[PDB]
Design an enzyme around this catalytic site. Structure first.
Site, PDB file in Angstrom:
ATOM      1  NE  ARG A   1     -26.394 -13.604 -13.161  1.00 13.35           N
ATOM      2  CZ  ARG A   1     -25.169 -13.901 -13.159  1.00 13.35           C
ATOM      3  NH1 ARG A   1     -24.329 -13.807 -13.936  1.00 13.35           N
ATOM      4  NH2 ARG A   1     -24.935 -14.665 -11.948  1.00 13.35           N
TER       5      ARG A   1
ATOM      6  CG  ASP B   1     -33.929 -13.027 -12.347  1.00 16.20           C
ATOM      7  OD1 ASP B   1     -34.432 -13.841 -13.080  1.00 16.20           O
ATOM      8  OD2 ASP B   1     -33.357 -11.973 -12.761  1.00 16.20           O
TER       9      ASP B   1
ATOM     10  CG  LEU C   1       0.549 -26.764 -27.858  1.00 17.60           C
ATOM     11  CD1 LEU C   1       1.044 -27.165 -29.295  1.00 17.60           C
ATOM     12  CD2 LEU C   1       0.639 -28.088 -26.854  1.00 17.60           C
TER      13      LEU C   1
ATOM     14  CD  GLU D   1      -0.363 -21.203 -16.392  1.00 17.49           C
ATOM     15  OE1 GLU D   1      -0.814 -21.299 -15.317  1.00 17.49           O
ATOM     16  OE2 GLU D   1      -0.771 -20.278 -17.389  1.00 17.49           O
TER      17      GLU D   1
ATOM     18  CE  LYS E   1     -23.522 -18.036 -13.270  1.00 17.47           C
ATOM     19  NZ  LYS E   1     -22.882 -17.187 -14.281  1.00 17.47           N
ATOM     20  CG  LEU E   2     -24.846 -26.012  -9.046  1.00 13.68           C
ATOM     21  CD1 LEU E   2     -25.872 -27.195  -8.870  1.00 13.68           C
ATOM     22  CD2 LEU E   2     -23.530 -26.427  -8.850  1.00 13.68           C
ATOM     23  CB  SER E   3     -21.851 -21.611  -9.542  1.00 13.35           C
ATOM     24  OG  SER E   3     -21.783 -20.712 -10.599  1.00 13.35           O
TER      25      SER E   3
ATOM     26  CD  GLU F   1     -21.278   3.161 -25.646  1.00 13.79           C
ATOM     27  OE1 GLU F   1     -22.020   3.672 -24.473  1.00 13.79           O
ATOM     28  OE2 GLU F   1     -20.275   2.541 -25.609  1.00 13.79           O
TER      29      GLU F   1
END
Ligand SMILES: COC(=O)[C@H](Cc1cnc[nH]1)NC(=O)CN(CC(=O)O)Cc1ccccc1
Ligand SMILES: COC(=O)[C@H](Cc1cnc[nH]1)NC(=O)CN(CC(=O)O)Cc1ccccc1
Ligand SMILES: [Zn+2]
Length: 956
Positions: free
Chosen positions: A387, A853, A295, A299, A857-859, A69
């Site tokens: 992205r 760029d 399940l 929490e 996304k919103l955040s 790789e």
């Protein structure tokens, strides 16, 4: 109608908010392909995934497929320059990477949209005629060994491999993934292996076209992307390799009912509980693993974690299905332990079985499935845009598992309710399958066995049958109850209309003494989410080390309290972040805006009327103690990075200062501190998303009001709003700070050339130089000189000031890495003079594309603005301003800047270095310039006291 294309798939189901256009198809040679058409993307991307990974390594050369790789990047027949690919991307706003799992090797890149083809073509070659150059193979084996070395001393990796190495040793599962200098050169040398041959063999055997998925994403028409892919990829060889399977588990009940006692590096305390299960992948439409995961992992009230946390035995818990390979998975339940917990393990595991027993007695529950099905459907419909690099990568993987049409939805939508399967998997979570590992410092000395690859110390036992029988007879336990309807699930998703007075950047819609409110209604993404960011300024949160510890503990305690309550919301995709800064506190609330004012109110309320449970205090404090200690186990490069931040900030409290001041934090003393810190604050907030100006003001005011009512809070004086300054280093000065890392046997170094304040002009100078040297730094210091795996260049920015930094973690000594970097800086001055005027404009354009760029996304838009706000720069148009200016810079400008601030004998060269030495110290290559003699910093206070501080930057 076409011979190159086996199938053309259909209408790949997508969220109906997804404007991107899709086509899947199988090629003639068997490659599965998704084509993503996005006419507005700023970067195109592609990815290939080959369904083969380190499980198919040959036994005599561990980590070969991981190493292969690494080598596809370093040269192919059509594009033989060692770094043709690296450089092609760098110059066209791209980036790239690869990973290797047990069963996949996965390659992705992104590039500026108009160079998709150029990028993609150099890419296809990885899979057709790579080179595995003899000289590269030799050099690059060192990258792998560093990567391994990095991993050797980190617990996550040690446990990961210690699992593999206690299953059936004959099973492919037990193998060593990464490889090292030993396994991939030292030893294949000893046994007369030509590795270049062995790589060629493997690539030829297994990189067959029937084991490949491609995703390409570009501005092009779908029909255009189609042609392009067929062109570059039809030429791939179909060697018709059968896909490897592992139908037989590596954990064989010669291996079940075992307990392992493990020595950690960090001072940590966890218990791992594992059960072997079959491969549930095919059951993906019903997903029993998720259900039992949901399940057990729960929490909320009446959950399993709730009880263990309430007997003070555990702090956090994680449960659910765990990926194994085609043929096997695991089901796990992992907890960290308190001090008390470490001595009630037997008990804890019994409690786990009582909970499993409860699920058996209650039966599988369709209403719970219905909930999971609904959260998932909503999650999918309103999923944020990805992205492109991550996206192609991700789909390329899952193309191997799902019909073309289901690829987007397969990981999201649930379809079949399957009591039987739930009930079937539930039948495997029994004491006679159980595997238990306890990880604790208390086993030092007391272990008797060693894991060969990482050197892990452990003891191995049978679990006494007294104890198994004891777990098999798990009563029901009244304190365990299933979750009730999740009240936090959103029901209202209607996008509010864009207002008459809405603006492209956050507007300052409130500026009292108490609060500064930044707001922008979302004019871009149209999802029913919002982002609510608050910075709470109080000077007491950092006034001294002790106070800092309290600010922290306070915040942890609070999070701990709300956990049960908020977890319900987390699952409804509504979440919060809350930690303390050097400035005070920070609080984010992100997610479906529907029930969002509710969570916010519950937080501020809890925060301002907090009651502290002594036993929680006790435990969290001990946890924090370990936590500070454990810094001494972090990677050499993080150490170096930390010391630098300590050296260049007006104020900053060291870890030793914090831990010594921490035995001084009594329960009564924190109880004073809280009402105290809350008493005067100022608050800056960005409210961003699906909300209206009035909704926003309301939320901001509601926060203030809650503090005013319950904590008597009043405003800070503007002059108490101290932001902190950076130290100002002299002209032609060079300082060195030196420390040793006691755990890691690599060493590390950060070099910082300080330049000047941030300003449109100084900003771009550094950025453009950063860009031009980005890829050569990497190609010189790692690919050629192979100084380490970790090699990073790029801008540094803090407290309004900026400069260039290098970071290297390496076997060789710091003074040595210094010389090779300084050597490298000359190579750069030369090749800037030498480089063509068009070559230079590429880099300008490249940095421009990078800088421009659009957030997807919103955040991600929120992040950009919060950047401007917490930095008190408030330049929401910076990206345009600064690009405009960059486009008008010349070779001459950048050389002046280099000879001014950076060159070895520069007039205004300000330089500090952190040398972090390894556990154990005290030609082909270019000319390193002889260096000044440094001023060795011996004391961080004596150092900062004797230097000017910089001005803080100017707003607007
Ligand atoms: C969200 O629903 C789940 O299934 C649980 C919930 C949980 C939250 N806190 C503890 N449990 N989550 C998980 O089981 C996490 N999984 C799967 C995942 O992360 O995708 C188990 C896991 C995670 C890392 C390594 C091995 C297993
Ligand atoms: C220190 O440098 C890196 O971060 C490198 C690779 C890189 C290439 N071009 C820019 N950076 N490493 C990684 O990103 C780490 N990968 C593994 C690898 O490349 O071998 C880690 C990883 C693990 C799971 C999923 C995704 C990535
Ligand atoms: Zn690697």
């Amino acid at each position: 109608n076409n011979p190159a294309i086996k199938r053309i798939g259909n209408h790949i189901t997508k969220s109906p908010e997804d404007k991107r256009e899709y086509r899947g198809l199988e090629l003639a040679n068997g490659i599965k392909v998704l084509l993503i058409s996005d006419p507005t993307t700023d970067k195109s991307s592609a990815a290939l995934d080959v369904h083969i990974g380190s499980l198919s390594d040959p036994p005599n050369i561990a980590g070969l497929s991981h190493f292969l790789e690494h080598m596809l990047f370093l040269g192919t027949k059509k594009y033989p320059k060692e770094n043709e690919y690296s450089q092609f991307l760098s110059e066209h706003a791209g980036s790239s990477n690869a990973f290797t799992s047990g069963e996949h090797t996965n390659y992705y890149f992104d590039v500026s949209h108009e160079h998709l083809e150029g990028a993609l073509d150099r890419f296809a070659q990885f899979f057709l005629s790579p080179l595995f150059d003899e000289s590269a193979k030799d050099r690059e084996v060192n990258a792998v060994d560093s990567e391994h070395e990095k991993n050797v001393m980190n617990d996550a990796w040690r446990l990961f491999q210690l699992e593999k190495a206690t299953g059936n040793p004959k099973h492919p599962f037990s193998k060593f993934g990464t490889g090292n200098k030993y396994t991939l050169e030292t030893r294949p040398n000893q046994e007369g292996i030509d590795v270049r041959q062995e790589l060629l063999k493997f690539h030829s055997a297994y990189y067959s076209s029937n084991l490949m998925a491609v995703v390409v994403l570009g501005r092009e028409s779908l029909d255009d992307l189609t042609n392009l892919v067929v062109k570059l990829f039809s030429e791939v060889e179909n060697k018709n390799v059968p896909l490897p399977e592992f139908p037989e588990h590596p954990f064989q009940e010669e291996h079940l009912k075992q307990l392992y006692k493990i020595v950690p590096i960090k001072d940590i305390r966890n218990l791992y509980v594992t059960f072997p299960i079959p491969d549930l992948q095919k059951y993906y439409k019903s997903n029993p693993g998720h259900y039992l995961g949901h399940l057990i992992g729960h929490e909320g009230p009446g959950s399993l974690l709730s009880e263990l946390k309430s007997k003070g035995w555990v702090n956090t818990l994680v449960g659910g299905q765990k990926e194994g390979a085609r043929g096997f998975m695991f089901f796990i339940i992992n907890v960290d332990l308190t001090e008390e917990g470490l001595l009630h393990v037997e008990d804890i595991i019994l409690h786990m079985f009582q909970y499993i027993q409860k699920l058996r007695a209650e039966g599988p529950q369709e209403w719970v499935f219905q909930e999971l099905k609904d959260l998932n459907a909503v999650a999918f419909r309103f999923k944020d845009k990805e992205r492109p690099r991550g996206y192609t990568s991700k789909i390329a993987g899952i193309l191997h598992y799902y019909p073309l049409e289901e690829v987007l939805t397969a990981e999201y939508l649930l379809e079949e309710f399957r009591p039987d399967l739930i009930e079937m998997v539930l039948d495997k979570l029994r004491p006679e399958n159980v595997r238990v590992a306890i990880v604790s410092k208390s086993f030092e000395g007391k272990t008797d066995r060693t894991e060969e690859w990482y050197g892990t110390q452990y003891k191995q036992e049978a679990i006494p049958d007294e104890v198994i029988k004891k777990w098999q007879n798990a009563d029901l336990n009244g304190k365990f109850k299933l979750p009730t309807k999740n009240e936090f699930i959103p029901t209202n998703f209607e996008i509010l209309p864009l207002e008459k007075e809405a603006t492209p950047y956050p507007a300052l819609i409130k500026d009292t003494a108490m609060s500064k409110l930044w707001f922008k209604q979302d004019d871009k993404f149209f999802l029913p989410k919002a982002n609510l960011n608050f910075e709470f300024f109080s000077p007491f949160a950092y006034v001294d080390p002790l106070h800092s510890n309290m600010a922290y503990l306070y915040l942890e305690l609070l999070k701990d309290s709300l956990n049960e309550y908020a977890y319900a919301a987390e699952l409804a995709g509504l979440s919060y972040d809350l930690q303390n800064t050097i400035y005070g506190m920070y609080l984010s609330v992100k997610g479906y805006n529907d029930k969002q004012p509710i969570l916010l109110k519950k937080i501020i309320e809890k925060m301002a009327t907090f009651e502290i449970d002594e036993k929680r205090f006790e435990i969290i404090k001990e946890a924090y103690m370990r936590s500070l200690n454990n810094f001494r186990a972090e990677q050499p490069h993080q150490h170096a990075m930390y010391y630098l931040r300590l050296l260049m900030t007006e104020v900053a409290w060291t870890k030793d200062e914090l831990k010594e001041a921490l035995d001084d934090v009594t329960l009564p003393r924190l109880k004073a501190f809280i009402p105290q810190l809350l008493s005067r604050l100022h608050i800056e907030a960005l409210l961003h998303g699906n909300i209206t100006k009035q909704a926003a003001l309301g939320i901001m005011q509601m926060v203030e009001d809650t503090l005013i009512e319950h904590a008597h809070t009043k405003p800070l004086l503007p002059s108490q709003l101290v932001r902190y300054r950076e130290v100002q280093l002299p002209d032609r000065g060079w300082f060195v700070y030196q420390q040793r890392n006691e755990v890691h046997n690599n060493s590390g170094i950060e070099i910082y050339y300080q330049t000047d304040m941030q300003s449109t002009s100084e900003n771009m100078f550094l950025e453009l130089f950063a860009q031009i040297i980005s890829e050569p730094a990497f190609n010189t210091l790692r690919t050629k000189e192979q100084l380490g795996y970790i090699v990073f260049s790029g801008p540094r920015r803090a407290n309004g000031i900026q400069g260039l930094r290098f970071i290297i973690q390496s076997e060789k000594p710091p003074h040595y890495l210094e010389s090779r970097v300084e050597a490298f800086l000359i190579t750069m001055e030369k090749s800037i003079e030498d480089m063509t005027e068009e070559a230079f404009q590429k880099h300008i354009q490249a940095l421009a594309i990078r800088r421009l760029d659009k957030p997807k996304k919103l955040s991600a838009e929120s992040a950009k603005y919060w950047g401007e706000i917490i930095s008190q720069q408030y330049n929401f148009d910076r990206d345009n301003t600064e690009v405009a200016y960059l486009k008008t810079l010349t070779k001459e400008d950048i050389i002046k800047f280099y000879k001014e601030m950076l060159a070895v004998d520069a007039p205004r060269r300000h330089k500090v270095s952190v040398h972090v030495l390894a556990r154990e110290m005290d030609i082909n290559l270019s000319q390193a310039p002889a260096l000044p003699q440094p001023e060795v910093i011996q004391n961080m206070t004596e150092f900062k006291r004797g230097l000017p501080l910089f001005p803080l930057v100017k707003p607007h």
